[PDB]
Amino acid sequence: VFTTVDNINLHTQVVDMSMTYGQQFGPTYLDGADVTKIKPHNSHEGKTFYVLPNDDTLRVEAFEYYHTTDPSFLGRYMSALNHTKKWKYPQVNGLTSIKWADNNCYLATALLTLQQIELKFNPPALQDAYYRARAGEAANFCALILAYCNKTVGELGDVRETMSYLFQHANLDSCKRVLNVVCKTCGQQQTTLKGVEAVMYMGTLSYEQFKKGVQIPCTCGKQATKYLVQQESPFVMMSAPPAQYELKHGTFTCASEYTGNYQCGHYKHITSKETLYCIDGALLTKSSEYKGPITDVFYKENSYTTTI
Numbered sequence: 001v002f003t004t005v006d007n008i009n010l011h012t013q014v015v016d017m018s019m020t021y022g023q024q025f026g027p028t029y030l031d032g033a034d035v036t037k038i039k040p041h042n043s044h045e046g047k048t049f050y051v052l053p054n055d056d057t058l059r060v061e062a063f064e065y066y067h068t069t070d071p072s073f074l075g076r077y078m079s080a081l082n083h084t085k086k087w088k089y090p091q092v093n094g095l096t097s098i099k100w101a102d103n104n105c106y107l108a109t110a111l112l113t114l115q116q117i118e119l120k121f122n123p124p125a126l127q128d129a130y131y132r133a134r135a136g137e138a139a140n141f142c143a144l145i146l147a148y149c150n151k152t153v154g155e156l157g158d159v160r161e162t163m164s165y166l167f168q169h170a171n172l173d174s175c176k177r178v179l180n181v182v183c184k185t186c187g188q189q190q191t192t193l194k195g196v197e198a199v200m201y202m203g204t205l206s207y208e209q210f211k212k213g214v215q216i217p218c219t220c221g222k223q224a225t226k227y228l229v230q231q232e233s234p235f236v237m238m239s240a241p242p243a244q245y246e247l248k249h250g251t252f253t254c255a256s257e258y259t260g261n262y263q264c265g266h267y268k269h270i271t272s273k274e275t276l277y278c279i280d281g282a283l284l285t286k287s288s289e290y291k292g293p294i295t296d297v298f299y300k301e302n303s304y305t306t307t308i
Protein backbone atom coordinates (compact mmCIF):
# COMPACT_ATOMS: atom_id res chain seq x y z
CA VAL A 1 0.00 0.00 0.00
CA PHE A 2 0.85 3.78 0.32
CA THR A 3 0.59 5.62 3.71
CA THR A 4 0.31 9.45 3.77
CA VAL A 5 -0.89 12.30 6.04
CA ASP A 6 -1.54 14.91 3.25
CA ASN A 7 -2.32 12.70 0.19
CA ILE A 8 0.67 14.47 -1.54
CA ASN A 9 3.77 12.73 -0.06
CA LEU A 10 3.08 8.97 -0.56
CA HIS A 11 5.30 6.52 1.48
CA THR A 12 5.58 2.86 0.14
CA GLN A 13 4.69 0.10 2.69
CA VAL A 14 4.19 -3.71 2.22
CA VAL A 15 1.97 -5.16 5.04
CA ASP A 16 1.28 -8.66 6.45
CA MET A 17 -2.32 -9.91 5.72
CA SER A 18 -2.38 -11.91 9.08
CA MET A 19 -1.98 -8.58 11.06
CA THR A 20 -4.48 -5.65 11.45
CA TYR A 21 -3.50 -2.20 10.03
CA GLY A 22 -3.60 -0.76 13.65
CA GLN A 23 -0.97 -3.32 14.81
CA GLN A 24 1.51 -2.19 12.02
CA PHE A 25 0.75 1.60 11.41
CA GLY A 26 -1.35 2.83 14.37
CA PRO A 27 -4.79 4.36 13.60
CA THR A 28 -5.23 3.90 9.78
CA TYR A 29 -8.24 5.26 7.74
CA LEU A 30 -9.60 4.49 4.22
CA ASP A 31 -11.70 7.19 2.44
CA GLY A 32 -12.95 8.22 5.97
CA ALA A 33 -13.72 4.63 7.16
CA ASP A 34 -11.59 3.67 10.25
CA VAL A 35 -9.74 0.38 9.37
CA THR A 36 -7.51 0.45 12.55
CA LYS A 37 -8.78 -2.98 13.87
CA ILE A 38 -9.46 -4.52 10.35
CA LYS A 39 -6.86 -6.58 8.31
CA PRO A 40 -5.95 -6.21 4.58
CA HIS A 41 -8.55 -7.50 1.98
CA ASN A 42 -7.19 -8.40 -1.57
CA SER A 43 -8.88 -5.26 -3.19
CA HIS A 44 -6.46 -3.25 -0.88
CA GLU A 45 -3.39 -3.68 -3.23
CA GLY A 46 -1.68 -0.28 -3.93
CA LYS A 47 -4.58 1.87 -2.45
CA THR A 48 -3.70 4.97 -0.29
CA PHE A 49 -4.28 5.03 3.55
CA TYR A 50 -4.18 8.10 5.85
CA VAL A 51 -2.21 7.34 9.12
CA LEU A 52 -1.89 9.25 12.43
CA PRO A 53 1.64 10.77 12.34
CA ASN A 54 3.97 8.32 14.23
CA ASP A 55 7.47 9.63 13.10
CA ASP A 56 9.01 13.10 12.67
CA THR A 57 8.69 13.12 8.83
CA LEU A 58 4.88 12.55 9.15
CA ARG A 59 4.42 15.14 11.95
CA VAL A 60 6.26 17.82 9.93
CA GLU A 61 4.30 16.83 6.75
CA ALA A 62 1.00 17.00 8.83
CA PHE A 63 1.76 20.45 10.25
CA GLU A 64 2.77 21.73 6.76
CA TYR A 65 -0.56 20.45 5.24
CA TYR A 66 -3.10 21.27 8.07
CA HIS A 67 -1.32 23.92 10.24
CA THR A 68 -2.07 21.93 13.46
CA THR A 69 -0.15 19.35 15.63
CA ASP A 70 -3.38 18.28 17.44
CA PRO A 71 -3.29 14.47 17.41
CA SER A 72 -7.18 14.28 17.46
CA PHE A 73 -7.44 16.38 14.21
CA LEU A 74 -6.99 13.52 11.70
CA GLY A 75 -9.61 11.27 13.36
CA ARG A 76 -12.14 14.14 13.82
CA TYR A 77 -11.59 14.97 10.06
CA MET A 78 -12.00 11.31 8.98
CA SER A 79 -15.18 10.95 11.14
CA ALA A 80 -16.81 14.07 9.56
CA LEU A 81 -15.68 12.99 6.00
CA ASN A 82 -17.43 9.65 6.55
CA HIS A 83 -20.75 11.63 6.60
CA THR A 84 -19.87 14.60 4.29
CA LYS A 85 -18.94 12.28 1.33
CA LYS A 86 -22.60 10.92 1.55
CA TRP A 87 -24.27 14.41 1.44
CA LYS A 88 -25.61 15.91 -1.87
CA TYR A 89 -23.95 19.14 -3.20
CA PRO A 90 -26.34 20.60 -5.82
CA GLN A 91 -25.48 23.64 -8.02
CA VAL A 92 -28.05 26.36 -7.04
CA ASN A 93 -27.84 29.76 -8.87
CA GLY A 94 -24.23 28.92 -9.95
CA LEU A 95 -23.21 28.21 -6.28
CA THR A 96 -22.43 24.77 -4.63
CA SER A 97 -24.99 24.30 -1.79
CA ILE A 98 -25.69 21.25 0.44
CA LYS A 99 -28.88 19.18 0.62
CA TRP A 100 -30.23 19.19 4.26
CA ALA A 101 -28.72 16.36 6.38
CA ASP A 102 -27.29 15.95 9.95
CA ASN A 103 -28.13 19.59 10.98
CA ASN A 104 -25.84 20.99 8.21
CA CYS A 105 -28.01 24.13 7.50
CA TYR A 106 -25.23 26.32 9.03
CA LEU A 107 -22.46 24.68 6.90
CA ALA A 108 -24.45 25.21 3.66
CA THR A 109 -24.86 28.91 4.65
CA ALA A 110 -21.11 29.22 5.41
CA LEU A 111 -20.20 27.37 2.13
CA LEU A 112 -22.43 29.68 -0.01
CA THR A 113 -20.98 32.75 1.77
CA LEU A 114 -17.37 31.60 1.24
CA GLN A 115 -17.98 31.36 -2.58
CA GLN A 116 -18.97 35.14 -2.70
CA ILE A 117 -16.20 36.75 -0.52
CA GLU A 118 -12.39 36.96 -1.21
CA LEU A 119 -10.36 34.73 1.18
CA LYS A 120 -6.94 33.03 1.11
CA PHE A 121 -6.66 30.10 3.57
CA ASN A 122 -3.15 29.64 5.09
CA PRO A 123 -3.31 25.82 5.52
CA PRO A 124 -2.78 24.16 2.10
CA ALA A 125 -5.32 21.49 3.04
CA LEU A 126 -8.10 24.14 3.39
CA GLN A 127 -7.06 26.14 0.22
CA ASP A 128 -6.89 22.95 -1.92
CA ALA A 129 -10.31 21.83 -0.59
CA TYR A 130 -11.91 25.33 -1.06
CA TYR A 131 -10.88 25.21 -4.75
CA ARG A 132 -12.37 21.72 -5.13
CA ALA A 133 -15.57 22.91 -3.38
CA ARG A 134 -15.99 25.94 -5.78
CA ALA A 135 -15.84 23.38 -8.64
CA GLY A 136 -18.73 21.28 -7.13
CA GLU A 137 -16.77 18.63 -4.99
CA ALA A 138 -17.18 20.00 -1.42
CA ALA A 139 -17.30 16.87 0.84
CA ASN A 140 -13.62 17.29 1.85
CA PHE A 141 -14.00 21.02 2.53
CA CYS A 142 -17.09 20.48 4.78
CA ALA A 143 -15.25 17.79 6.84
CA LEU A 144 -12.25 20.15 7.28
CA ILE A 145 -14.58 23.00 8.43
CA LEU A 146 -16.08 20.61 11.05
CA ALA A 147 -12.56 19.48 12.21
CA TYR A 148 -11.07 23.06 12.33
CA CYS A 149 -14.17 24.35 14.32
CA ASN A 150 -14.19 21.44 16.85
CA LYS A 151 -17.67 20.41 15.65
CA THR A 152 -18.98 16.87 14.94
CA VAL A 153 -21.68 15.95 12.43
CA GLY A 154 -25.15 16.64 13.97
CA GLU A 155 -23.90 19.36 16.38
CA LEU A 156 -25.92 22.64 16.18
CA GLY A 157 -23.75 25.34 14.52
CA ASP A 158 -23.64 29.18 14.56
CA VAL A 159 -22.57 30.70 11.17
CA ARG A 160 -20.83 33.73 12.84
CA GLU A 161 -18.82 31.34 15.09
CA THR A 162 -17.83 29.16 12.04
CA MET A 163 -16.83 32.23 9.91
CA SER A 164 -14.78 33.51 12.92
CA TYR A 165 -12.79 30.24 13.14
CA LEU A 166 -12.28 30.06 9.35
CA PHE A 167 -11.10 33.73 9.18
CA GLN A 168 -8.49 32.90 11.89
CA HIS A 169 -7.09 30.31 9.35
CA ALA A 170 -7.13 32.90 6.46
CA ASN A 171 -4.67 35.67 5.46
CA LEU A 172 -6.27 38.84 6.93
CA ASP A 173 -2.93 40.55 7.94
CA SER A 174 -3.40 43.44 5.40
CA CYS A 175 -6.92 44.01 6.89
CA LYS A 176 -7.10 47.17 9.09
CA ARG A 177 -9.98 48.92 10.96
CA VAL A 178 -9.62 52.34 12.67
CA LEU A 179 -12.49 53.34 15.06
CA ASN A 180 -13.01 56.56 17.05
CA VAL A 181 -14.97 56.51 20.38
CA VAL A 182 -16.60 59.83 21.57
CA CYS A 183 -17.77 60.33 25.26
CA LYS A 184 -18.82 63.83 26.55
CA THR A 185 -16.45 63.27 29.60
CA CYS A 186 -13.43 60.94 28.73
CA GLY A 187 -13.62 62.52 25.22
CA GLN A 188 -12.12 60.93 22.06
CA GLN A 189 -10.03 57.72 21.71
CA GLN A 190 -9.11 56.00 18.39
CA THR A 191 -8.17 52.25 18.19
CA THR A 192 -6.61 50.24 15.28
CA LEU A 193 -7.86 46.60 14.89
CA LYS A 194 -6.14 44.11 12.50
CA GLY A 195 -6.99 40.62 11.10
CA VAL A 196 -10.30 38.94 12.07
CA GLU A 197 -11.29 41.76 14.48
CA ALA A 198 -11.02 44.18 11.46
CA VAL A 199 -13.76 42.36 9.39
CA MET A 200 -16.31 41.27 12.12
CA TYR A 201 -18.57 43.52 14.32
CA MET A 202 -21.35 42.11 16.55
CA GLY A 203 -24.23 44.53 17.36
CA THR A 204 -25.76 45.85 14.09
CA LEU A 205 -26.40 44.44 10.58
CA SER A 206 -26.05 47.85 8.75
CA TYR A 207 -22.59 48.84 7.40
CA GLU A 208 -24.17 52.34 6.85
CA GLN A 209 -25.11 52.59 10.57
CA PHE A 210 -21.50 51.61 11.61
CA LYS A 211 -20.20 54.56 9.46
CA LYS A 212 -22.71 57.04 11.06
CA GLY A 213 -21.98 55.65 14.57
CA VAL A 214 -23.59 53.34 17.19
CA GLN A 215 -24.15 53.88 20.95
CA ILE A 216 -21.84 51.73 23.22
CA PRO A 217 -21.13 51.78 27.00
CA CYS A 218 -18.08 53.86 28.11
CA THR A 219 -15.92 52.60 31.08
CA CYS A 220 -16.53 56.14 32.61
CA GLY A 221 -20.19 54.90 32.95
CA LYS A 222 -21.77 57.22 30.30
CA GLN A 223 -23.06 56.21 26.79
CA ALA A 224 -20.51 56.97 23.96
CA THR A 225 -20.39 56.78 20.10
CA LYS A 226 -18.23 54.33 18.08
CA TYR A 227 -17.91 55.21 14.35
CA LEU A 228 -15.77 53.73 11.53
CA VAL A 229 -12.84 56.01 10.54
CA GLN A 230 -10.97 53.76 8.06
CA GLN A 231 -11.66 50.23 6.62
CA GLU A 232 -9.05 48.31 4.51
CA SER A 233 -10.49 44.84 3.68
CA PRO A 234 -12.07 43.00 0.69
CA PHE A 235 -15.30 42.53 2.74
CA VAL A 236 -16.92 43.13 6.14
CA MET A 237 -19.20 40.84 8.21
CA MET A 238 -21.94 42.69 10.21
CA SER A 239 -23.79 40.50 12.80
CA ALA A 240 -26.60 40.93 15.43
CA PRO A 241 -29.07 38.72 17.35
CA PRO A 242 -31.79 37.68 14.82
CA ALA A 243 -34.40 40.45 14.12
CA GLN A 244 -36.75 41.51 11.26
CA TYR A 245 -34.56 43.34 8.68
CA GLU A 246 -35.22 44.61 5.14
CA LEU A 247 -32.61 43.57 2.47
CA LYS A 248 -32.48 45.84 -0.67
CA HIS A 249 -31.18 44.52 -4.07
CA GLY A 250 -27.59 45.75 -4.71
CA THR A 251 -26.75 47.23 -1.21
CA PHE A 252 -25.16 44.01 0.30
CA THR A 253 -23.46 40.79 -1.10
CA CYS A 254 -25.22 38.02 0.95
CA ALA A 255 -26.87 37.38 4.39
CA SER A 256 -27.71 34.65 7.00
CA GLU A 257 -31.52 34.26 7.71
CA TYR A 258 -32.14 32.42 11.07
CA THR A 259 -35.62 31.05 12.12
CA GLY A 260 -36.68 29.44 15.45
CA ASN A 261 -35.16 28.98 18.94
CA TYR A 262 -31.56 29.59 20.11
CA GLN A 263 -29.46 26.58 18.90
CA CYS A 264 -32.24 24.22 17.43
CA GLY A 265 -33.41 26.65 14.63
CA HIS A 266 -32.40 26.68 10.93
CA TYR A 267 -30.45 29.05 8.63
CA LYS A 268 -31.16 29.98 5.00
CA HIS A 269 -28.96 32.10 2.67
CA ILE A 270 -30.02 35.41 0.90
CA THR A 271 -27.77 36.52 -2.01
CA SER A 272 -28.09 39.78 -4.07
CA LYS A 273 -27.63 39.05 -7.84
CA GLU A 274 -29.82 40.58 -10.61
CA THR A 275 -32.68 39.93 -8.04
CA LEU A 276 -32.71 38.49 -4.43
CA TYR A 277 -32.34 34.69 -4.21
CA CYS A 278 -33.08 32.60 -1.11
CA ILE A 279 -31.08 29.31 -1.00
CA ASP A 280 -32.45 26.65 1.44
CA GLY A 281 -30.09 23.73 0.70
CA ALA A 282 -31.29 22.23 -2.61
CA LEU A 283 -34.28 24.67 -2.78
CA LEU A 284 -34.26 28.07 -4.57
CA THR A 285 -36.80 30.93 -4.36
CA LYS A 286 -36.37 34.53 -5.67
CA SER A 287 -38.09 37.92 -5.06
CA SER A 288 -37.29 41.66 -5.71
CA GLU A 289 -37.73 42.64 -2.01
CA TYR A 290 -37.00 40.80 1.29
CA LYS A 291 -38.05 41.29 4.97
CA GLY A 292 -37.29 38.55 7.52
CA PRO A 293 -35.12 37.43 10.45
CA ILE A 294 -31.39 38.21 9.66
CA THR A 295 -28.30 37.72 11.95
CA ASP A 296 -25.44 38.28 9.42
CA VAL A 297 -24.91 40.59 6.39
CA PHE A 298 -21.73 40.56 4.17
CA TYR A 299 -20.70 43.72 2.24
CA LYS A 300 -18.00 44.36 -0.42
CA GLU A 301 -15.11 46.76 0.52
CA ASN A 302 -11.55 47.79 -0.60
CA SER A 303 -10.59 51.20 1.03
CA TYR A 304 -12.98 53.47 3.00
CA THR A 305 -12.20 56.75 4.84
CA THR A 306 -14.97 58.76 6.67
CA THR A 307 -15.90 62.42 5.83
CA ILE A 308 -16.33 63.61 9.55
Ligand SMILES: Cc1ccc(/C=N/O)cc1C(=O)N[C@H](C)c1cccc2ccccc12
Pocket residue numbers: 156157158159240241242258260261262263264265295
Ligand atom coordinates in the same frame (compact mmCIF):
# COMPACT_ATOMS: atom_id res chain seq x y z
C1 LIG B 1 -27.65 27.82 15.92
C2 LIG B 1 -26.69 28.11 17.03
C3 LIG B 1 -25.70 27.18 17.39
C4 LIG B 1 -24.82 27.50 18.43
C5 LIG B 1 -24.94 28.72 19.10
C6 LIG B 1 -24.07 29.12 20.21
N1 LIG B 1 -23.16 28.40 20.63
O1 LIG B 1 -22.34 28.87 21.67
C7 LIG B 1 -25.88 29.66 18.75
C8 LIG B 1 -26.75 29.38 17.76
C9 LIG B 1 -27.75 30.42 17.48
O2 LIG B 1 -28.92 30.20 17.82
N2 LIG B 1 -27.29 31.52 16.84
C10 LIG B 1 -28.18 32.58 16.42
C11 LIG B 1 -27.78 33.06 15.06
C12 LIG B 1 -28.21 33.61 17.51
C13 LIG B 1 -27.07 34.32 17.85
C14 LIG B 1 -27.07 35.26 18.89
C15 LIG B 1 -28.23 35.52 19.62
C16 LIG B 1 -29.42 34.85 19.39
C17 LIG B 1 -30.57 35.12 20.16
C18 LIG B 1 -31.72 34.43 19.89
C19 LIG B 1 -31.75 33.47 18.87
C20 LIG B 1 -30.64 33.16 18.06
C21 LIG B 1 -29.45 33.83 18.30
Ligand SMILES: [Cl-]
Pocket residue numbers: 067068
Ligand atom coordinates in the same frame (compact mmCIF):
# COMPACT_ATOMS: atom_id res chain seq x y z
CL1 LIG C 1 -0.55 27.72 12.24
Ligand SMILES: [Cl-]
Pocket residue numbers: 082083086
Ligand atom coordinates in the same frame (compact mmCIF):
# COMPACT_ATOMS: atom_id res chain seq x y z
CL1 LIG D 1 -23.78 8.90 6.94
Ligand SMILES: [Cl-]
Pocket residue numbers: 100101102103104105266
Ligand atom coordinates in the same frame (compact mmCIF):
# COMPACT_ATOMS: atom_id res chain seq x y z
CL1 LIG E 1 -30.65 20.90 8.79
Ligand SMILES: [Cl-]
Pocket residue numbers: 067122123168169170
Ligand atom coordinates in the same frame (compact mmCIF):
# COMPACT_ATOMS: atom_id res chain seq x y z
CL1 LIG F 1 -3.75 28.61 9.78
Ligand SMILES: [Zn+2]
Pocket residue numbers: 067122123169
Ligand atom coordinates in the same frame (compact mmCIF):
# COMPACT_ATOMS: atom_id res chain seq x y z
ZN1 LIG G 1 -1.46 28.48 9.94
Ligand SMILES: [Zn+2]
Pocket residue numbers: 083102153
Ligand atom coordinates in the same frame (compact mmCIF):
# COMPACT_ATOMS: atom_id res chain seq x y z
ZN1 LIG H 1 -24.48 11.26 8.49
Ligand SMILES: [Zn+2]
Pocket residue numbers: 183184185186187218219220221222
Ligand atom coordinates in the same frame (compact mmCIF):
# COMPACT_ATOMS: atom_id res chain seq x y z
ZN1 LIG I 1 -15.93 58.37 29.27
Ligand SMILES: [Zn+2]
Pocket residue numbers: 103104105106265266267
Ligand atom coordinates in the same frame (compact mmCIF):
# COMPACT_ATOMS: atom_id res chain seq x y z
ZN1 LIG J 1 -30.59 23.07 10.46
